Every structure is written in C-alpha cells, then in structure tokens.
Design a protein around this nucleic acid. Structure first.
Ligand SMILES: Nc1nc2c(ncn2[C@@H]2O[C@@H]3COP(=O)(O)O[C@H]4[C@@H](O)[C@H](n5cnc6c(=O)[nH]c(N)nc65)O[C@@H]4COP(=O)(O)O[C@H]3[C@H]2O)c(=O)[nH]1
Ligand code: IRI
Ligand code: IRI
Ligand code: IRI
Ligand code: IRI
Ligand code: IRI
Ligand code: IRI
Ligand code: IRI
Ligand code: IRI
Ligand code: IRI
Ligand SMILES: [Mg+2]
Ligand SMILES: [Mg+2]
Length: 90
RNA sequence: GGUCACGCACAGGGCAAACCAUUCGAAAGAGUGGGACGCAAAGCCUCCGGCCUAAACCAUUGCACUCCGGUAGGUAGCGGGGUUACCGAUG
C-alpha cells in the first residue's frame, strides 16, 4: 500500500484546479516535498487529487495526519494510489 | 458580358492581429475608439471536426499522468461545409 503518492477525493468540485492545487500544496507541503500535485476536473477525474511526495514516508504522515480533515467544508478521503506516478514510475 | 472554378498579377479599394483605453461577461471572450500582424472573402452563417471557458443547473464518490460529462457560452483570424461579392494576364 504505502506509496510516494497519496490519493485524495471527496474534494469540493466547486474549487478550481489553480486554487485547489495552491491550497492542497499549502496544507500538505507541511509533511515533506511535493514532486507535484495532479488535479483534473474532467467527468471522472473530478473531486479527487493526487499528491506525490519526495519521500514515501511523507505520504504516510499525510494520510495518517489529515484523514477526514475539513477542507472547504468537506472532509478528505485519503488513501494510497493503487499505482505509482509516471514520475515515480519512470 | 452571365456561369462554374482559378489567383503569377492589373487596377480601385476593403478588413484589421498583438497591444492600449473604455464597456459588457463568472470566464473564455465580445463591443467601441486608437493601432496593424496579417488576410482574395480576415464579408456572413455553428451544419460537421477541432480548440477555449465552464458562475449557475443536472448528473458523477470517481485512480489519473494524450485528452474528453450534459447544458451554456466562445472561437468564422483552426479547419471544413453553406452563402453573398470586386478585379480579370487566367483556364
Ligand atoms: N480584386 C482581387 N484581386 C486579387 C484576387 N486574388 C488575387 N488578386 C490579386 O493578386 C494579388 C495576390 O493576392 P494574394 O496572394 O491572395 O494576397 C492578397 C490578399 O491576401 C490580401 N488582400 C487584399 N485585398 C483583400 C480582400 O479584399 N480580402 C482578403 N481576404 N484579402 C485581401 O492582400 C494581398 C495583396 O493584395 P493585392 O495588392 O489586391 O494583390 C493581390 C491582388 O492584386 C481577388 O479575389 N480579387
Ligand atoms: N495597389 Ir493594390 N492597393 N496593393 N490595388 N494591388 N490591392
Ligand atoms: N468591472 Ir469587471 N470588467 N473587471 N465586470 N468586475 N470583470
Ligand atoms: N483565403 Ir484562407 N488562405 N485566408 N480563408 N483559405 N485560410
Ligand atoms: N461544430 Ir463546434 N460543436 N459548433 N466543434 N465549431 N464548437
Ligand atoms: N458548440 Ir456549443 N453550440 N454545443 N458553443 N459548445 N454550446
Ligand atoms: N469560412 Ir471557413 N474558411 N473560416 N468556416 N470554411 N474554415
Ligand atoms: N485573436 Ir485569436 N489569436 N485569440 N485570432 N481570436 N484565436
Ligand atoms: N467560404 Ir469556405 N472558407 N471556402 N467557408 N466554403 N470553406
Ligand atoms: N468570362 Ir472569362 N470565362 N471568358 N472569366 N473572362 N475567362
Ligand atoms: Mg497567393
Ligand atoms: Mg480582416
């Protein structure tokens, strides 16, 4: 399970890629280095975001630390990415 | 001449990108004035394919790294298609 990337969803869809990123990057950059933050608003990539960390140990903290954390009046469903990210993969 | 194409010009003209000002819009963007990058339809029309925005509404709890919900708007200076038109070495 543990992975460089954490998988978030139940994300307020009203938020925009730009700001969603900034804010996610704000909150989560507290736990380590973010190689990147992937947010798309397409039909089925929406309400979710991937947060890729430098250290796999950063992700675990994130997960553990901020589960269900209230974010834009919603709670965060956090969990690991079944797979890695092309950065971490390649 | 008229027609259907064509654009090496001829000749008389037309439009106006970026950017600025100001107005409208949530945004894309559009209006108007200034201003020209270009344009032989850069006149006009969303039927077809792209791309852009996506406040509201409706659906979607959804695992991606090409990108893509419905609806709505935009782009005709992205194409194609329709349609109107000036000049005639041209065919
Ligand atoms: N009247 C007429 N003349 C034609 C036509 N096709 C070609 N020509 C002549 O041939 C020249 C070359 O045209 P171009 O390569 O398409 O290049 C043209 C074109 O791209 C542009 N342009 C000029 N007027 C117009 C216009 O009314 N509409 C559009 N869309 N573009 C224009 O400027 C360029 C040079 O302009 P010109 O000094 O007139 O120079 C033009 C013009 O003299 C046509 O359908 N009608
Ligand atoms: N000269 Ir004239 N103006 N440029 N006619 N060719 N279009
Ligand atoms: N004024 Ir206004 N143009 N800037 N409407 N807010 N968008
Ligand atoms: N003539 Ir025209 N080249 N400008 N429209 N086809 N794109
Ligand atoms: N055809 Ir349309 N849908 N109208 N692509 N141009 N946007
Ligand atoms: N193409 Ir419409 N017409 N469908 N613009 N997107 N709304
Ligand atoms: N006219 Ir038209 N050239 N712009 N639509 N065909 N693409
Ligand atoms: N100006 Ir315009 N570049 N934005 N042509 N409309 N596409
Ligand atoms: N005019 Ir027309 N540009 N040639 N639209 N038909 N494609
Ligand atoms: N009319 Ir005649 N056909 N003869 N256009 N000038 N070439
Ligand atoms: Mg030519
Ligand atoms: Mg023009």
């Amino acid at each position: 399970r543990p992975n460089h990337t954490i998988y978030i969803n139940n994300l307020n869809e009203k938020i925009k890629k730009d700001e969603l990123k900034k804010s996610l990057h704000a909150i989560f950059s507290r736990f380590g280095q973010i190689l990147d933050i992937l947010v798309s608003r397409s039909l089925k990539m929406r309400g979710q975001a991937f947060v890729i960390f430098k250290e796999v140990s950063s992700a675990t903290n994130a997960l553990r630390s901020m589960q269900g954390f209230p974010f834009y009046d919603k709670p965060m469903r956090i969990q690991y990415a079944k797979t890695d990210s092309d950065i971490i993969a390649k």
